[PDB]
Design a protein around this nucleic acid. Structure first.
Lengths: 452, 91
RNA sequence: GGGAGUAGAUAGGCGCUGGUGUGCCUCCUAGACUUCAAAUCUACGGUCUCGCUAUUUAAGCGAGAGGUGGGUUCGAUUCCCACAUACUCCCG
């Protein structure tokens, strides 16, 4: 027992084995981790050999020297992929962020008056113009955007909402569970599938401080189903003197039909010009910018929200703020194609095949590869457009040696890693989400796994 | 926050007795904030951190320190001699 | 004087490492080599000590200590704790 462990060398001795091989710091860390795995494996009597030690210690070093979060090549064809980090950023934005983070900036400083200033002041100019709302505000994310409006205007008082709009988006967010913690009392009207206007108007009373509607972003209902029109709820509010609050969620900044895609998804400008008092949404969904809770509406309300002592715990960071301004700057200049998420969904059907076969031309040489391009209909929107179904070209592949399952697995372990769909033992690569500079990296990773 | 605030001691001075004196059935937290953007000199007393933890483990109450500065390491190791607290040491 | 930080050898100065210590530089001594010097290289080397044979001394041989003590541990030079000491910083 006590000889199968004395064996394990000394950390000073393996540090030497890797003089300039690897940084001394990373070597000792790998030696300790490895030194402990052999002390316990020999104590339980499951190891008789120690030759695996030297080879392993170097593997920990090779592993411990790489950050965990890593860029990932998305081949699934889902633009708003909740799991892969939603809306990706254009180089233009990322450099504007790079520069403001490089050194000091006038984040909370107004250069004119030479005294402290509100950091939320830089942006709001853009929002008010783009939406048409009276005033605006921005916080960490939309989850908090909701929580803030409720605790600001309905703490202790009733909020009416349709029983079909109490959603569970994400793993931890649930309108009913957060609104609870929001301090607002929840008044659910109508039924799951159907909800008329009479349901809303019927539950109003002395405590009703808010009429709230949530947009079913991550799901939808078909069959016998009724919903309350937006113009109707504005009318109902202005009748009793109650505010209207729409949680768009998708955070669509513009009309979407303007780009060829025909859908009813709501957007700020239009929802604002409808008579709604407040509107919110995430910046990293249909806006295509960094994570951000966006609120626009009546000035008297925005000012009530801002003054809330909880807004300081949600106030946005220096990175997303800047990055959001450049994203908004692009919107004013109509540079639509510059923002990843808008370009990916409004891409020419022709455009997609053009990239579908430019990849197939790069994989015909690789050994054992069965390459075919198929025209499939998928659902692009992951966290904002549930029903949408648009055509896109998938380059379906298949190797004689390895199986589709094992294939996805190694591809997610590659550097860079690639995540893709699987359908009937045929790995699939949706080109709707693939950047050009990835095509070269796709071919170089597949040739390293099948010819190695 | 929804938490009920029980302020002990006085501005410039605060002994341990002050903390231990306000505990009761509803006391669910013993919280200390580090004065990050200001400081008091002259007749000023503070409760040693070690004593707060001792008081917590006596009555079975958790201790919560808002360092604020977020100092990850000992600062004296770099030539600057200050008593600024840090995660490692405070933990 | 009171706190606190940095700390530690078993030749000497610095740095490291849960594997019974070790690497860099220096000193010393020794060896190798070198026309001379230098350079270079090497050392289960060195301190203290104690104990053993002889015992005037010489001479040969064996063992332990890491500031001190304790603890964890299969194993502590490494880690914890206590006290001491050195250097430094703050206060009366």
């Amino acid at each position: 027992m006590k000889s199968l462990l004395r064996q394990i060398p000394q950390i000073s001795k393996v540090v030497e084995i890797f003089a300039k091989a690897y940084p001394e710091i990373y070597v000792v860390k790998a030696a300790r981790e490895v030194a402990e795995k052999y002390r316990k494996e020999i104590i339980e009597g499951a190891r008789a050999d120690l030759n695996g030690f030297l080879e392993d210690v170097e593997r920990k070093i090779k592993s411990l020297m790489k950050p965990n979060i890593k860029r990932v090549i998305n081949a699934t064809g889902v633009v708003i992929n909740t799991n892969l980090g939603r809306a990706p950023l254009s180089k233009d934005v990322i450099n504007f962020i790079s520069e403001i983070a490089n050194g000091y900036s006038n984040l909370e400083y107004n250069l004119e008056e030479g005294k402290r200033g509100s950091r939320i002041a830089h942006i709001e100019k853009y929002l008010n113009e783009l939406t048409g709302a009276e005033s605006s505000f921005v916080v960490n994310n939309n989850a908090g955007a909701v929580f803030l409006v409720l605790n600001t205007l309905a703490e202790g008082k009733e909020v009416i909402i349709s029983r079909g709009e109490l959603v569970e988006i994400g793993g931890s967010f649930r309108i009913p569970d957060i609104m609870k913690k929001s301090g607002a009392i929840l008044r659910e009207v109508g039924t799951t599938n159907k909800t008329k206007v009479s349901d809303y108007e019927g539950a109003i009373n002395q405590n009703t401080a808010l009429l709230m509607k949530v947009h079913k972003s991550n799901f939808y209902m078909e069959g016998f189903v009724e919903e309350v029109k937006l113009e109707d709820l504005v009318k109902l509010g202005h009748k009793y003197g109650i505010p209207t609050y729409y949680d768009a969620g998708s955070g669509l900044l513009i009309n979407l039909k303007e780009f060829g895609i025909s859908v009813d998804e709501p957007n700020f400008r239009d929802c604002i010009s409808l008579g709604i008092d407040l509107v919110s949404g995430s910046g990293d969904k249909l806006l295509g910018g960094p994570q951000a809770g966006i609120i626009v509406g009546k000035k008297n309300l925005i000012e009530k929200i801002k003054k809330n002592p909880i807004a300081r715990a949600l106030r946005i960071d220096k990175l997303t703020l800047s990055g959001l301004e450049m994203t908004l700057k692009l919107y004013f200049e109509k540079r639509y194609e510059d923002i990843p998420v808008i370009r990916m969904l409004t891409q020419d059907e022709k455009a997609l095949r053009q990239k579908a076969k430019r990849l197939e031309k790069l994989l015909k040489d690789i050994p054992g590869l069965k390459i075919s391009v198929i025209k499939d209909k998928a659902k692009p929107g992951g966290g904002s457009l549930p029903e949408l179904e648009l055509p896109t070209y998938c380059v379906a592949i298949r190797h004689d040696r390895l199986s589709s399952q094992e294939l996805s697995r190694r591809l997610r372990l590659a550097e860079p890693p690639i995540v893709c769909r699987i359908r009937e033992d045929q790995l699939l690569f949706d080109m709707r989400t693939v950047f050009h500079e990835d095509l070269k990296t796709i071919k170089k990773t597949l040739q390293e796994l099948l010819s190695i």
